[PDB]
């Protein structure tokens, strides 16, 4: 197959582990990884969980859910 | 069609989202995205400047995904 590079990211989703912003749902990683800021630093934010819920509510949100809008 | 339609998989409209400018600093942002599916690259327009993300590079992926996933 000729791949669509987006396809392997379609199940990605965000989660807060305490103040650390993480990315779940990436198949080739066997472990979750940290989300990075625009200056390449792991995101650590005191209001992490409230920020996530401010955006999506309680409903979980994957990249596929974003792309079907 | 096939590449053309692949490029259209990413929206062309304005995205209202949030961007972490530092490890602990966040602000609202409105952006536009373009996708070239031939080589796997996304170009983002932010504050009138261009940013590029290689979808085969894990560090770029970890930088782009929070911007897409916090969009409303």
Numbering used by the authors:
A (entry chain B): 60 to 128
B (entry chain A): 40 to 111
Task: Please share excerpts from the published article on this structure.
Unlike most other members of enveloped viruses that utilize one or a limited number of viral proteins for entry, poxvirus encodes four (A26, A27, D8 and H3, protein names refer to VACV) and another eleven proteins (A16, A21, A28, F9, G3, G9, H2, J5, L1, L5 and O3, protein names refer to VACV) to mediate attachment and membrane fusion, respectively. For the eleven fusion associated proteins, they are proposed to assemble into a large machinery, called the entry-fusion complex (EFC). In this study, we carried out structural characterization on VACV G3 and L5 proteins. These two EFC-component proteins, have been previously shown to interact with each other to form a stable sub-complex, and show highly conserved amino-acid sequences among orthopoxviruses.
Eventually, we solved the sub-complex structures at 1.8-Å (for P21 space group) and 1.5-Å (for P31 space group) resolutions using the single-wavelength anomalous dispersion method, respectively. The Rwork/Rfree values were refined to 0.202/0.221 (for P21 space group) and 0.190/0.206 (for P31 space group), respectively. Because protein terminus residues are much better traced in the electron density map for the structure with the P21 space group than the structure with the P31 space group, description of the structural elements below is based on the P21 structure unless otherwise specified. The complex structure, within the crystallographic asymmetric unit, contains G3 (amino acids A40-K111) and L5 (residues K60-R128) in single 1:1 binding mode. As can be viewed from the overall structure, G3 and L5, with good shape complementarity, are stacked together to form a globular fold. G3 consists of four anti-parallel β-strands (β1-β4) and two α-helices (α1-α2), assembling into a compact structure (Figure 1(F,G)). Helix-α1 intersperses the β-sheet on the lateral side. L5 is composed of three anti-parallel β-strands (β1’-β3’), two α-helices (α1’-α2’) and one 310 helix (η1’) (Figure 1(F,G)). One conserved disulfide bond is observed between C75 in β1’-strand and C107 in α1’-helix to stabilize the structure. On the whole, large surface areas are buried in the sub-complex, which are calculated to be ∼1606 Å2 for G3 and ∼1553 Å2 for L5, respectively. The extended binding interface can be further subdivided into three binding patches (Patch1, 2 and 3) based on the G3 elements involved in L5-engagement. In comparison to the other two patches, the third patch therefore shows the best overall structural complementarity, the largest number of participating amino acids, and the most diverse types of inter-chain contacts (van der Waals, hydrophobic interactions and hydrogen bonds). Taken together, a total of 15 residues in G3 and 18 amino acids in L5 are positioned along the binding interface, providing extended inter-molecule interactions for sub-complex formation (Figure 1(M,N)).
